Enzyme design. Structure first.
Site, mmCIF file in Angstrom:
data_model
loop_
_atom_site.group_PDB
_atom_site.id
_atom_site.type_symbol
_atom_site.label_atom_id
_atom_site.label_comp_id
_atom_site.label_asym_id
_atom_site.label_seq_id
_atom_site.Cartn_x
_atom_site.Cartn_y
_atom_site.Cartn_z
ATOM 1 N N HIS A 1 0.816 -1.207 0.000
ATOM 2 C CA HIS A 1 0.000 0.000 0.000
ATOM 3 C C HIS A 1 0.856 1.265 0.000
ATOM 4 O O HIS A 1 0.485 2.252 -0.626
ATOM 5 C CB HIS A 1 -0.984 0.001 1.160
ATOM 6 C CG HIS A 1 -2.117 -0.936 0.948
ATOM 7 N ND1 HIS A 1 -3.424 -0.583 1.163
ATOM 8 C CD2 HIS A 1 -2.145 -2.196 0.459
ATOM 9 C CE1 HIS A 1 -4.209 -1.599 0.861
ATOM 10 N NE2 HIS A 1 -3.458 -2.592 0.429
ATOM 11 N N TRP B 1 3.808 -13.071 -9.233
ATOM 12 C CA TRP B 1 4.840 -13.357 -8.252
ATOM 13 C C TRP B 1 4.598 -12.618 -6.939
ATOM 14 O O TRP B 1 4.800 -13.173 -5.848
ATOM 15 C CB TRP B 1 6.218 -13.012 -8.804
ATOM 16 C CG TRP B 1 6.527 -13.765 -10.060
ATOM 17 C CD1 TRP B 1 6.002 -14.955 -10.446
ATOM 18 C CD2 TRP B 1 7.427 -13.369 -11.095
ATOM 19 N NE1 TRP B 1 6.509 -15.332 -11.663
ATOM 20 C CE2 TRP B 1 7.371 -14.361 -12.093
ATOM 21 C CE3 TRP B 1 8.260 -12.268 -11.285
ATOM 22 C CZ2 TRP B 1 8.117 -14.279 -13.261
ATOM 23 C CZ3 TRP B 1 8.999 -12.195 -12.435
ATOM 24 C CH2 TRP B 1 8.926 -13.182 -13.411
HETATM 25 CA CA LIG Z 1 3.813 5.884 -0.420
#
Ligand SMILES: [Ca+2]
Ligand code: HEM
Ligand SMILES: [Ca+2]
Length: 330
Positions: A47, A164
């Site tokens: 994130h 992956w």
């Molecule tokens: Ca960032």
């Protein structure tokens, strides 16, 4: 080089990481376990990093999700990331590395705690974040394969690299996809970095583990396992299906490709040549436990073969009747 804590490392600038390692192993990862906090820390690496686009901007792996949490915490894809941001903040405040470095370091250390895991290269020296990420740069589980691959591609990843990186879902659960069953894992072995995720996502769905109708979810093959809509589709889409299947029962490939692609991800928005290689600080992971298998009670006829060039490999099923997957404690 010899560090202030008495330990040795190749580059003496990396010595600062040893007390941080000790602190996170004890006080974030509950004694170096491959559990909830490792899983959440690994999700946080993505994130933070994926907030990078040559067009839309964003500083990538820059700690912005912590430093600019008042902004990024409100992004839709960041639902349920606030807990791990809150848990990491006191470490960032207390130690002497940047937030961007800390996020990637905690993720790499965490993966190294998981049986079957791999040592991800780690570089030190990311500057402090300068601005919040643009919104809407994190892929969503209800985005189509083309949308996910386009976003990941924009950040720099090929389709095979997306597959992956999704090995991460082998050590992973969901708390907000179906909020009625938090801690429900994506594979039957959320404490083991292994190929079960790639196998079990290929099975025909059978049931919802909790409520029906959740956005970004589809039916799972096992009680106590949740399946993302995105993972369902990536396992079956011609762009990704053969690569997905190629991970099954190929532990060295899962390990090597995950390490290399995580290193690339950890460096989004950064320049390796302006950082210090501190890879030798990452611990040696435990050996793989278990072997690749179909869940008990399942057979090849339950696999939805989606790779046009190559048949799904012949795996053995665990013995006994069909069983449920326990949730991740925490
Ligand atoms: Ca960032
Ligand atoms: C390619 C697109 C991806 C999508 C759509 C996606 C989606 C999701 C979703 C919806 C969750 C559950 C969040 C919750 O409800 O608690 C999740 C969890 C997780 N994701 Fe992904 N993900 C993707 C890629 C990645 C990548 C590249 C990583 C690499 C670090 C990653 C690591 C994780 C981990 C470790 C968890 C488990 C978190 C936990 O146990 O609380 N994901 N992902
Ligand atoms: Ca697993």
């Amino acid at each position: 080089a010899t560090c202030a804590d008495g330990r040795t490392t190749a580059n003496a600038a990396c010595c600062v990481l040893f007390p941080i390692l000790d602190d996170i192993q004890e006080n974030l990862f509950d004694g170096a376990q491959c559990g909830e906090e490792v899983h959440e820390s690994l999700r946080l690496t993505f994130h933070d990093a994926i907030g990078f686009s040559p067009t839309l901007g964003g500083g990538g792996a820059d700690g912005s999700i912590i430093t600019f949490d008042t902004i990024e915490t409100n992004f839709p894809a960041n639902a349920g990331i606030d807990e791990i941001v809150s848990a990491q903040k006191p470490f960032v405040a207390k130690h002497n590395i940047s937030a961007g470095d800390f996020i990637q370091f905690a993720g790499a250390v965490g993966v190294s705690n998981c049986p079957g895991g791999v040592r991800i290269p780690f570089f030190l020296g990311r500057p402090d974040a300068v601005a919040a990420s643009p919104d809407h740069l994190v892929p969503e589980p209800f985005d189509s394969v083309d949308t996910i691959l386009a976003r990941m591609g924009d950040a720099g990843f090929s389709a095979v690299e997306v597959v992956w990186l999704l090995a991460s879902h082998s050590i992973a659960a969901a708390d907000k996809v179906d909020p009625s069953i938090p801690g429900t894992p994506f594979d039957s072995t959320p404490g083991v970095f292994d190929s079960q995720f790639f196998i079990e996502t290929q099975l025909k769905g059978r049931l919802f583990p909790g409520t029906p109708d959740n956005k970004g979810e589809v039916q799972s093959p096992l009680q106590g396992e949740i399946r993302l809509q995105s993972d369902h589709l990536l396992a079956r889409d011609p762009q990704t299906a053969c690569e997905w299947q190629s991970m099954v029962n190929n532990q060295p490939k899962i390990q090597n490709r995950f390490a290399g692609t995580m290193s690339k991800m950890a460096l989004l928005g950064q320049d390796k040549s302006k950082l210090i290689d501190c890879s030798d600080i990452i611990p040696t992971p435990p050996a793989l436990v278990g072997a690749a298998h179909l869940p008990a009670g399942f057979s090849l006829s339950d696999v939805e073969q989606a790779c046009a060039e190559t048949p799904f490999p012949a795996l053995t099923a665990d013995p006994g009747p069909v069983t449920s997957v326990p949730p991740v404690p925490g």
